[PDB]
């Protein structure tokens, strides 16, 4: 084992390890089994900001 990767294996792993991660679920705005929409009572413009 006289080889040292370049770029390093560790380096690249950790890096792709976080790219792997799927984007977060965005409940806000949808209804729950009871029929009430979830989220906070905030203006659409304000929320965006």
């Amino acid at each position: 084992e006289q080889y040292r990767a370049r770029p390093g294996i560790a380096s690249v792993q950790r890096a792709t390890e976080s790219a792997e991660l799927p984007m977060k679920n965005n409940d806000e705005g949808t209804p729950d089994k009871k029929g009430n929409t979830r989220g906070d009572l905030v203006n659409e413009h304000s929320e965006a900001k």
Binding site: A5, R6, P7, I9, V12, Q13, T16, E17
Partner: protein
């Protein structure tokens, strides 16, 4: 600044470098699983309507 001061390593050899860059990165690939999900995500939509 970035555009103004870039340089490669003097001992660069693409064929080797990228090989070492892809291996660890592809070894953690999730393509396959995402494909399966994409399949359901659809079935779901279809069912709903």
């Amino acid at each position: 600044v970035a555009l103004l001061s870039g340089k490669y390593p003097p001992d660069l050899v693409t064929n080797v470098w990228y090989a070492d860059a892809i291996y660890p990165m592809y070894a953690d690939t999730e393509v396959f699983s995402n494909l399966q999900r994409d399949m359901i995500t659809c079935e779901a939509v279809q069912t709903l309507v």
